[PDB]
Write a protein that binds this ligand. Structure first.
Ligand SMILES: [Cl-]
Ligand SMILES: [Cl-]
Ligand SMILES: [Cl-]
Ligand SMILES: [Cl-]
Lengths: 121, 121, 119, 119
């Protein structure tokens, strides 16, 4: 692809409390990363005709990264030219499954997402 | 002042759990608003020579807004040409003071901050 | 009202970026309040037979509280004997509506939620 | 190890934007984990005479865990009989160092903290 410049990086954490769903942790992390920010004008100032033209790169770190369903994670972003990378990281919290809380196994999975908005150089 | 265009809006919540310090709630809200984002390039793309040239407007809503110490709140921002508005809003959580937790009165004060980065037109 | 002991209070913020949907801001605030905590043993130390027996009181401050669909907000909580009280508060962020971002009007609505577990 | 009952688990994220300071990311993560919750009655239902008697276990995942100043991280917690375990994890965000923002190197370090109250 064409070289690009980083504009803003939005970071967030997401948690799968029941276990076995790193995709859920990852999706929630992307949502958390962007939910508290709004981008009314940066895209204009950068020279785009619409926010859907912005380049958005997502970097996720989570346990069992190979189990993350990419399409579901990227669909959290409302617009843009989107890419995702998934790598091992985040954290596992070990603890005996609580049936009353609908736990699937003895792990809570925590993902981190960095959502970067870039402009082509 | 010169008219300006909104680029990004970063929102956060801050809480004074002991009571009597809306300034603390407000300061924590501004910190929360910006802590999870980084701005490596937007300022460049917008035409500034340094991030300290960016216009940063802070809007805070909190109980007892008249008690907020402006200078302390604005010092949370690491750079920029800064302004603050404080208005009544946020929320008060009522509850009997717990001496063991060092409560000052029967209220927890919750502030909201919107930190907007703008560029002059 | 009744005097009950407060155990834990979880606080969160939620935002309706497009305007006219205080319910969305409120629902997101309750989610933000509870999403990053787990209560594996609170129900047991409280002497309850199941988490669904927990007494949970929710306080929300948001612009246009009268427009909040309350049961929708309470549905965010997976368990408990729940009640919600809505009041005017939180914050309105005003600014020109951005049609390209699907804004409904010139306001962003911010809600605060406090979720309290009582005994 | 010992088998103790978990009551509540509070989770948070913290970030060192300038690089080379995993301690800062870790401290901020513990703060983020607890800042938005209050525990007015947990110590009492646990049968303790004061919140300072609460057993608190902290688990942190961050890049360069060996460099974390542990007591500094634990100092974020106002009360309790506290312990911390640090492991490699969280995330490194790589990108060109921005001298104008006082970056130390080309990394941003992100830590995760889980704060558990046990009985
Ligand atoms: Cl989450
Ligand atoms: Cl806070
Ligand atoms: Cl939100
Ligand atoms: Cl942080």
């Amino acid at each position: 692809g064409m070289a690009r410049k980083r504009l803003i990086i939005e970071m967030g954490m997401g948690i799968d409390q029941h276990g076995q769903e790193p995709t859920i942790a990852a999706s929630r992390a992307v949502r958390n990363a962007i939910a508290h920010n709004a981008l009314p004008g940066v895209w204009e100032v950068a020279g785009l005709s619409h926010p859907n033209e912005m380049i958005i790169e997502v970097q996720v770190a989570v346990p069992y990264p190979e189990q993350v369903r990419e399409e579901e994670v990227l669909a959290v972003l409302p617009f843009g030219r989107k890419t995702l990378t998934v790598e091992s990281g985040g954290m596992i919290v070990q603890g005996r499954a609580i049936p009353e809380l609908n736990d699937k196994n003895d792990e809570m999975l925590i993902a981190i997402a960095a959502v970067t908005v870039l402009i082509e150089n």
